[PDB]
Every structure is written in C-alpha cells, then in structure tokens.
C-alpha cells in the first residue's frame, strides 16, 4: 500500500529495453566511467567523486528521482565545489565530461527499465524478515550493483544477469537477521533435503525448479505450498 | 550416442554441491589464483603458463579427466619444464605452490560437480544450428567463464549464476553462424512481438518465462510450440 503503490504506479511507466538498446545503453556506461577517468586523471578529483555529481545532475531530468535504497545527493558540500570545478575546463576535458553525462543519463536510462523486474523479484521474498518495501530497497541496490558488473561485449540480456545480482542482494539481507535456536534433527533433515532436491532439479531443468515441481520430486505429503513454507527456515529459501 | 553417450554416463556420477560446499571451493580457488600470481613475481613465467601446467597436474588425479570443450594441457614437455622451474624455488614460495595446486583442485571439483546443468542446457538449444556436442564444448567453456567472474564472498549460490555464462557461450555460437535474407515485415514484427512478450512477461515473473507462458501472452493462434519455432529465427532465441 501507501506510496509503494506509487512508486510500482510510477516505475509501471517505463518502457522495456530489447537486447539491443540494453547493449548500447551498456556500452554508454562503460565509455562513460572511461571518460570519468580522464577527468579525475586531469583534474585529481577521485573518480568516485566525479560520477556522483555527474549522476545527481542526471536524477534532475531522471524519470523516477527518488529511487528506494539508492543514497541520494553526494553531499551538498562536496556537489557544491566538485560540480564547480567541472564547469570551467579548458575544451579538450569538456568533451570527457559529455561522454560521461550522457554515460551516466544512460546508466540511469537502463537501471529504470529494470525497476518492475526488482519489484517482481522482491513479492517472491516477502514474508521473510523485510517489509515489501525493503526488499525493494535491497534489490534496487543489487540492480545497480548488476549494471557495474555486467559486460556489454557479451551481448547477451542484461534482465537476467542482473536478477542474480538483485537477489543476492536480497538474500543477503534477510539472512542477516537471524539467531542460532535449537530445531530437531528431523526437521534438519527436511531442510537439507528440500535443498539438495532443489539443486539437482536444477541440473536438470538448466533453471531453478518451482516450488510446485520440488514437491513433485518430495510428494506426496509435499506440496508446492509446504515446500515454500519449510523452505523459510533453510539456507536457501526461495527458487527462482 | 557415441563418446558423448560415455561423457553423459561418467558426469552422472559426480555429486551436488551445496551452497556451502560451492562457496568454499571458490574461495580456495581465488586464494590459488593469489598464490599463482605471486608465483608469477618469483619464477618470472606468465600466470597461466602457470595455471595451466598446475591445471594439467590435476586433471590426472580429477574425476572427469577429458572435459569437451575445454583448453589441452599444455604437453609432457612445457609441462615437466615449468615443474622443474617450480620445484627449484625457496621454502619461503614453495608454500604458494600448495596453495594453487589447492584452489586449481578445488576448481575442478566446482567445474564437475556443475557438468550435468551444461548438459541440461545445452537441450535447450538444440536444432539451432550446432550439434549436441558442439552445443556441450561451448556451454563447458561458459562454465569455465564462470568459475572465473564468480564472488564466493557474495555467497549465493553458484550454478545460477553460471547458468547465464553457460548459455551466453552457446547463445554465440549459433548467433555466429547466420546470413542475412530479406524477410517478410509481418514476420519481423512478430519476432518482436514475440521478444517484447517475452521480457514484459520477465519484468513481472523475476525469471525468464516458459514457451507455454509466452504463448499465453501471445494467442490465442498461439501455443507453446509455435512460439519456440518461431523464436529461432530470433536475435533471442530460447527461454531459460
């Protein structure tokens, strides 16, 4: 509910990438950071520095401002004299800085196309320790994270390496807050059998099984919704 | 049938690894890949000379010998050239040398134990333009991709992430072998039609949607087979 429902109202906007504009929207990134480099290698800003004013003017015209879990502002401080800097730069540098705004505006471009998907991605973890919106939160870090590690030579879809990334980040989360109990040898046994049958279902199936099919490899007494419901408490809680 | 028919029985009985168990391989094989380098600053030979002659050491105690696909070892002779470069070294070194030989072992335990989720793959990639083989030598060498871009400190789990190295070495390879024709533009709106209904459905499942699914977006004129017909003249041929 309450603004949750706007921001999914909001994101719900934004168009879908194809492969193609995923990989050329990818490719603006990389040659951004590559000029971003220069600059700090020309002016000794720390490049660090450099993309996160570069970023916070692109979050003016962005689609979507205020993304959940992402830090906003690079500090009013330091946005108030490292933007002064890149400014007044002799021509030759000014070129540098194009080619990282348009990186970082494209950067922006290809994280908003992949919102919905983060939101899909945290409803499949709910009920686990975080509020929806937290799980938001985590899982748009993990995107950003995605988009700095993704390889765009490999032309292959950014959607799905990016859900790797997006849930680990969730995961991470939610198995952080956890204490060491006692729980009975057969449940125990359960557990680590709910997980080896969720794996070698996997080297099967070339994706992750459905709860639905792990209670097939477990039924009967298993079904998809007992799965899911034990599968809280393992090390490896939800598939796919 | 054939070798494959013998490959397919031999990686049969090579177990599952646990989230645990993969974690922990990684991490010996990142710490091999730090001793390998700092072998690299003693003995003054390239870091995957070295690998691969501590690689070829292994293969002969690992459990899958001869993985199709994957690089030759680097022959009897560079081989018992390199070892003899390595053995004459201080103790203070000789103590990398175990480190390496630990992880590069470690590494092909992480490599067999993830033979079966190539295979399975590799299935779903068939009759489109690479022989069963082929689609296998490729979708190993994605693997091996894999292994080496993976962070066992991130500590989630492994195979899924491989999955997408795995298919995007496939994916290439059959994305390689294609000319140009002139085709009708019903069709080219099609194949996008079908593509955008494949990534909308992604951005709202959190995974890559079946054939059956796709053609529930699609249809009615539409089942699950036409939709997977069609999608191989696709710049996005399979899902998941």
Same mark, same amino acid.
Not at 63 to 69: C, L, N, V, Y
């Given at each position: 509910s309450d603004p949750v429902r706007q921001y999914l109202h909001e994101i719900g906007q934004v168009p879908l990438l194809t492969l193609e504009e995923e990989i050329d929207l990818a490719r603006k990134v990389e040659e951004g950071m590559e000029a971003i480099k220069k600059l700090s290698e020309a002016t000794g800003l720390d490049q660090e520095l450099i993309r996160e004013v570069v970023r916070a003017k692109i979050l003016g015209t962005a689609? #979507?401002?205020? #993304?959940?879990?992402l830090k906003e502002k690079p500090d009013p401080k330091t946005v108030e004299e490292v933007d002064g800097k890149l400014k007044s730069l002799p021509k030759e540098l000014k070129r540098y800085l194009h080619i990282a705004r348009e990186g970082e505006a494209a950067r922006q471009h290809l994280i908003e196309a992949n919102l919905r998907l983060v939101v899909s991605i945290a409803k499949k973890y709910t009920?686990?320790?975080?509020s929806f919106l937290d799980l938001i939160q985590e899982g748009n870090q993990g995107l950003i994270r995605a988009v700095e590690k993704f390889e765009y030579k490999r032309r292959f879809k950014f959607s799905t390496y990016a859900t790797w990334w997006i849930r680990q980040a969730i995961n991470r989360a939610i198995a952080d807050q956890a204490r060491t109990i006692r729980i009975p040898v057969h449940m125990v046994e359960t557990i680590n059998k709910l997980s080896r049958t969720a794996r070698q279902l996997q080297q099967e199936l070339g994706r992750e099984p459905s709860y639905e099919e792990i209670a097939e490899a477990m039924?009967?007494?298993?079904d998809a919704k007992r799965v899911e419901e034990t599968l809280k408490i393992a090390q490896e809680p939800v598939s796919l």
């Open positions: 689609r #979507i401002q205020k #993304i959940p879990g009920g686990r320790g975080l039924g009967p007494g298993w």
